[PDB]
Design a protein around this motif. Structure first.
Motif, short mmCIF file in Angstrom:
data_model
loop_
_atom_site.label_atom_id
_atom_site.label_comp_id
_atom_site.label_asym_id
_atom_site.label_seq_id
_atom_site.Cartn_x
_atom_site.Cartn_y
_atom_site.Cartn_z
N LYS D 58 0.83 -1.19 0.00
CA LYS D 58 0.00 0.00 0.00
C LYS D 58 0.87 1.25 0.00
O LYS D 58 1.90 1.30 0.68
CB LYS D 58 -0.93 0.01 1.21
N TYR D 60 0.87 5.42 0.59
CA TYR D 60 0.16 6.51 1.24
C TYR D 60 0.86 7.82 0.93
O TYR D 60 2.08 7.94 1.11
CB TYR D 60 0.08 6.29 2.75
N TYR D 62 0.22 11.74 1.96
CA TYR D 62 -0.49 12.71 2.80
C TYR D 62 0.36 13.98 2.92
O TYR D 62 0.69 14.45 4.01
CB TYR D 62 -0.86 12.14 4.17
N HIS D 77 2.31 6.95 11.75
CA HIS D 77 2.18 5.95 10.69
C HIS D 77 3.36 5.00 10.60
O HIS D 77 3.17 3.78 10.58
CB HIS D 77 1.98 6.65 9.34
N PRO D 83 -2.36 5.49 9.57
CA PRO D 83 -2.32 6.62 8.63
C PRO D 83 -3.14 7.79 9.14
O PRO D 83 -4.14 7.63 9.85
CB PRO D 83 -2.93 6.04 7.35
N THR D 85 -5.60 10.19 8.17
CA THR D 85 -6.57 10.31 7.10
C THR D 85 -7.00 11.75 6.83
O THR D 85 -7.52 12.03 5.75
CB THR D 85 -7.80 9.46 7.41
N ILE D 88 -4.67 12.72 3.91
CA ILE D 88 -4.51 11.83 2.76
C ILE D 88 -5.41 12.28 1.62
O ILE D 88 -6.61 12.49 1.81
CB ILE D 88 -4.82 10.37 3.16
N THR D 91 -4.24 7.21 -2.24
CA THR D 91 -3.79 5.92 -1.74
C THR D 91 -3.57 4.99 -2.92
O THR D 91 -3.65 5.39 -4.09
CB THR D 91 -4.80 5.30 -0.76
#
Ligand code: SF4
Ligand code: SF4
Ligand code: SF4
Ligand code: SF4
Ligand code: SF4
Ligand code: SF4
Ligand code: FES
Ligand code: FES
Ligand code: FES
Ligand SMILES: [Zn+2]
Lengths: 98, 150, 98, 584, 98
Positions: D58, D60, D62, D77, D83, D85, D88, D91
């Motif tokens: 995955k 991420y 942000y 994180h 994470p 959010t 973000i 993703t």
């Protein structure tokens, strides 16, 4: 005829060379004088300075033509198409004449 | 002035043809500008036809012929940053510093110059100060950042 | 040998290879304006008063910096060249003081 | 656990080291084996400093991160597994949005690969195309594949690159040169710097492939001296490639040899032209020369020289690895492939975009660009840089390709696309572009040296309220004559903003000439400040803030602005709490 | 038939409509004309030629044949310029003067 809106840069030049007379106002930037003095005479006593409107042909480091490597050969005078480069007067008082 | 350093540099470059540009870049890197003495000392000892080196030094959009301050300000005047109001930022800098583009401060700490484009048009308007970039600038922000530097 | 013969302004001329159209026209008495041209040095291409119309080329060709070929058709007084020279001379006269 | 940091010339502008070392310091404070890798700008410079954290498979992102934010990221994180959010926007399951409609070929490795290390480039199928061309295929086949792919020059002209390569190959000479034009002087255009700081190895591979195709052994990159990170990464790239036998003598066991050098330019816009670039490379004053002879026949130092900009050399390895038919599948029947665009101006989502040609410009401004900033109305779009043109709103559906935008009076240029809303006047923008052209003229021929200044004077007179009747006629005749008389392409395309902004915005010029009013409210000479007598109540708050005191009136009574005294500074409208100061 | 074969080889009808009077009537007159092989070969040879000349002997050629040759030269645009046209040789020395 000239209109006042456009500008023609007026110079306050002073080049008291005993043989060569220069006037940047009458120059047309044909480059014949610098090309001859570089590619034939090889002294390169003059050169281009600036860009655009500010382009002007002037001696080395803006010094007077007497203090540079000039030979006073007069080729730049003899290839100029306008009155910017002129040779000095041999007679008592020179004139525009045929 | 330091002709001795101009010296290791010209020794190093005496050879390749077309080295006028590199010579002038290293001279500017050493001195911060091009004094007439350095231009004379370069026009000699490797020739390059003294009128020609001066003519090259003038053209080339980058060769500063005057001393500058400690901090060099590079306002972005590109199309994207001018669209977002570079003129207001420039007027703010001119008013707060009392100098125009192409001039240096009286105490010699700030100098104002114009650049083609920062390239960081996403953060427009942008200024450069000694390699540090400030983007998304309002006149109050540039005023605050120059008081902080001062 | 195999005479390089050109046709300029309606007339038929016999010329020598390797020259310029400006030199050939001067040889045969045809007047083409020029300011930055000298036969003893390399062409510069600054003024633009030496432009002529050559068949087969969509753009104007400078007669000071082109070589004569065999069987080319040249026009030196078309409307496009006339207005180009008029514009160039109007821009030159916008800065000339004397 | 691996983290990429999106540093660049734009990451420094907002965050930069402020993030990375902090993150690095956090790593040094925790001792976990975390791979912190420096990567260039992805293309979303509206969110930078870009940070990417890979939790397993995955990804991420942000970003818009400061040092405090970086510490929060590390504590939340990379250690806690949680994470953040609220920061973000992208993703793995919710990724390329702006990037969803983009086909990235020259921008494939931007923001992904550490540009200072060759191992990541090799891990991303790098230098495989060079190996294929060297070991399996002939230079004539190389030119054939370039022709089949339909490669056009990614500069202003759009010349077929295969023609230039073939012309350089057939040229007689024992020594030939390959020169990459990295000197783009267009304001608002920053694709070259992004490519150089993101993937110099693609440029090196493309230049090596071109050198093998033509037979040249020496390469040159004419990059501007004002791009220090780019030249540093190029030096690291040539060092890494020389250490891996990729450039130099006997590349990968083949008898072909190729080396390159970096030349730092002085930053002249006229050097974007080929002959002026050659003159600058030879250490002389950059000035265009007369063609013929072309650089493909007699270029650098009298030797045959092939000159192309950076984007084509970046595109070459991809089409060599994937085949020319794959690259020909994108684009149109007359313009095949993909193009990079520097998208900026009055837009929400700015930065570097990549689109296949044939896409409508409406898709570019709206689908990827997110529309106009502050929800204003789209008015125009400048393409091709200050030598380009301003496409109006009525031609918003024109597909982006060389012939289509040439039909509208504009040009491709390097790919600088600036969005203009209704609040910006076209007369002032034409004046700005013409001023930039005037400042960058080398002053050789009469037309570009004089006529551009004359047209700039006319535009200045129009924008200062001194425009006279017949100024438009003078502008169009000067523009036609300058276009017909200039030597190089700088003066030929110089009147493009002046003419095009006429053809679509002539009324504004009329509004600037006969009315002395600027509709976009940008020309301060043409501004008039009035006070609405109905919607403000005599507080003298504007007059106190005017050291010019051009406002007269009594307390609790409507005030009158003296137009003969007003210097039009704008301070008498910013402090207005009732918004009754009208700008007409 | 030669004229019809030249027409079928793709002449520019717009220019010959602008510069001539009565082109449409001539085209309507040659609407039902069949073309032979030798005529087709001669018409092709005249069409691919960049600079074709026609030399007509006035002693053995009627005037209407000269008119038809002039029509063929006009509709193809091979007249009025250098190295292209019709050369007509006269019977006597000063027939042109008479
Ligand atoms: S007189 Fe001779 S040496 Fe002196 S500037 Fe003129 S051409 Fe050069
Ligand atoms: S020859 Fe005369 S007109 Fe030509 S550039 Fe020199 S000084 Fe000027
Ligand atoms: S005669 Fe020629 S050089 Fe003298 S002032 Fe008149 S235009 Fe100028
Ligand atoms: S058109 Fe402008 S940039 Fe080009 S050679 Fe002429 S003056 Fe120089
Ligand atoms: S705009 Fe400025 S100069 Fe004009 S009245 Fe207001 S404060 Fe005074
Ligand atoms: S600040 Fe606004 S409300 Fe107050 S006097 Fe001025 S225009 Fe009227
Ligand atoms: S042109 Fe201003 S930041 Fe790029
Ligand atoms: S005489 Fe000046 S361009 Fe030829
Ligand atoms: S560094 Fe900002 S978009 Fe590349
Ligand atoms: Zn205005």
């Amino acid at each position: 005829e000239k209109d006042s809106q456009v500008e023609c840069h007026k110079t306050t030049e002073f080049d008291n060379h005993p043989f060569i007379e220069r006037n940047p106002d009458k120059c047309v930037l044909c480059g014949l004088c610098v090309r001859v003095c570089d590619e034939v005479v090889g002294a390169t006593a003059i050169g281009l300075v600036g860009r655009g409107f500010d382009s002007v042909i002037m001696p080395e480091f803006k010094l007077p033509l007497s203090e540079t490597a000039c030979i006073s050969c007069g080729q730049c005078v003899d290839v100029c198409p306008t009155g910017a480069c002129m040779e000095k007067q041999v007679s008592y008082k020179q004139i525009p004449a045929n | 002035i330091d002709l001795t350093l101009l010296e290791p540099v010209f020794k190093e470059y005496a050879g390749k043809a077309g080295s006028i540009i590199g010579i002038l870049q290293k001279t500017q890197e050493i001195y911060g500008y091009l004094p007439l003495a350095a231009l004379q000392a370069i026009a000699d000892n490797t020739d390059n036809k003294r009128a020609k080196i001066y003519g090259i030094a003038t053209f080339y959009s980058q060769f500063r012929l005057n001393p500058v301050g400690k901090y060099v300000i590079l306002q972005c005047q590109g199309t994207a940053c001018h669209v977002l109001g570079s003129k207001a930022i420039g007027s703010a800098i001119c008013d707060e510093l009392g100098i125009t583009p192409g001039q240096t401060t009286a105490d010699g700490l700030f100098t104002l110059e114009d650049v083609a484009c920062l390239g960081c048009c996403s953060l427009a308007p942008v200024i450069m100060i000694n390699g540090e970039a400030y983007g998304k600038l309002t006149p109050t922000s540039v005023r605050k950042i120059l008081q902080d530097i001062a | 040998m195999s005479k390089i013969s050109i046709n300029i302004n309606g007339r038929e001329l016999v010329v020598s290879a390797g020259q310029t159209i400006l030199q050939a026209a001067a040889e045969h008495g045809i007047e083409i304006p020029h300011l930055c041209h000298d036969e003893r040095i390399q062409p510069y291409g600054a003024c633009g008063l030496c432009v002529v119309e050559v068949e087969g080329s969509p753009k104007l060709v400078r007669s000071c910096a082109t070589s004569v070929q065999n069987g080319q058709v040249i026009r030196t007084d078309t409307s496009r060249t006339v207005v180009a020279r008029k514009t160039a001379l109007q821009l030159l006269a916008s800065d000339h003081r004397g | 656990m691996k983290v990429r940091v999106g540093l660049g010339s734009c990451g420094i502008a907002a965050g930069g080291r402020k993030v990375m070392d902090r993150l690095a310091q956090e790593i040094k404070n925790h001792g976990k084996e975390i791979e912190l890798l420096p990567t260039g700008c992805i293309g979303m410079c509206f969110y930078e400093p870009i940070v990417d954290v890979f939790d397993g498979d995955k990804v991420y992102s942000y970003a818009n991160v400061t040092a405090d934010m970086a510490t929060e990221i590390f504590n939340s994180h990379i250690i806690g597994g949680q994470p953040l959010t609220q920061y973000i926007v992208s993703t793995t399951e919710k990724p390329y949005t702006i990037l969803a409609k983009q086909v990235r070929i020259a921008l494939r490795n931007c923001g992904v690969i550490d540009p200072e290390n060759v191992d990541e480039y090799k891990a991303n199928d790098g230098y495989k195309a060079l190996s294929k061309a060297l070991k399996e295929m002939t230079p004539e086949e190389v030119i054939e594949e370039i022709k089949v792919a339909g490669l056009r020059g990614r500069g202003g002209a759009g010349f077929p690159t295969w023609f230039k390569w073939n012309a350089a190959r057939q040229s007689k000479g024992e020594i030939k040169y390959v020169v990459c034009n990295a000197d783009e002087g267009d304001p608002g255009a920053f694709m070259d710097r992004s490519v150089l700081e993101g993937d110099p190895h693609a440029l090196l591979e493309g230049m090596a492939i071109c050198g093998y195709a033509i037979g040249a052994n020496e390469g040159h990159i004419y990059c501007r001296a004002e791009y220090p990170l780019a030249i540093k990464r190029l030096e690291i790239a040539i060092a890494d490639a020389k250490q891996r036998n990729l450039l130099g003598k006997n590349i990968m066991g083949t008898n072909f040899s190729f080396d390159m050098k970096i030349k730092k330019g002085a930053g002249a816009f006229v050097c974007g032209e080929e002959t002026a670039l050659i003159a600058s490379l030879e250490g002389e004053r950059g000035m265009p020369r007369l063609k013929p002879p072309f650089p493909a026949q007699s270029g650098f130092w009298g030797k045959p020289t092939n000159i192309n900009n950076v984007e084509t050399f970046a595109n070459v390895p991809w089409i060599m690895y994937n085949g020319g038919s794959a690259y020909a599948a994108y684009g149109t029947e007359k313009s095949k492939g993909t193009k990079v665009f520097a998208l900026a101006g009055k837009i929400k989502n700015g930065g570097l975009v990549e689109v296949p040609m044939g896409m409508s410009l409406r898709e570019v401004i709206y689908d990827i660009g997110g529309g106009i900033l502050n929800d204003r109305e789209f008015k125009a779009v400048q393409m091709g840089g200050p030598s380009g043109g301003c496409i109006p709103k009525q031609l918003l559906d024109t597909p982006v390709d060389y012939d289509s935008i040439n039909k509208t009076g504009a040009i491709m240029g390097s790919g600088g696309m600036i969005v203009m809303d209704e609040t910006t006047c076209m007369v002032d923008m034409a004046r700005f572009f013409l001023d930039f052209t005037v400042k960058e003229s080398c002053g050789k021929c009469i037309y570009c040296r004089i006529g551009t200044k004359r047209m700039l004077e006319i535009l200045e007179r129009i924008t200062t309220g001194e425009g006279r009747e017949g100024d438009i006629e003078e502008l169009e005749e000067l523009s036609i004559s300058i276009k017909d008389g200039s030597l190089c392409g700088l003066g030929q395309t110089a009147p493009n903003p002046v003419l095009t902004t006429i053809r679509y915005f002539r009324d504004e010029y009329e509004a600037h000439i006969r009315d002395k009013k600027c509709p976009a409210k940008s020309c301060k000479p043409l501004l008039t400040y009035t006070i609405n007598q109905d919607n403000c109540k005599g507080c003298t708050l504007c007059a106190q803030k005017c050291p010019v005191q051009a406002i007269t009136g009594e307390k609790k009574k409507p005030h009158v602005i003296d137009q003969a005294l007003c210097t039009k500074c704008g301070n008498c409208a910013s402090v207005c709490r009732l918004d009754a100061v009208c700008i007409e | 038939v030669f004229l019809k074969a030249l027409l079928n080889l793709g002449v520019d009808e717009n220019k010959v409509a602008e510069k001539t009077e009565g082109f449409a009537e001539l085209k309507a007159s040659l609407a039902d004309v069949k073309v032979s092989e030798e005529i087709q070969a001669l018409a092709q040879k005249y069409a691919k030629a960049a600079k074709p000349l026609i030399v007509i002997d006035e002693d053995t050629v009627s005037a209407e044949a000269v008119k038809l040759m002039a029509y063929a030269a006009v509709i193809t645009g091979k007249i009025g310029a250098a190295y292209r046209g019709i050369i007509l040789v006269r019977t006597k020395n000063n027939t042109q003067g008479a």
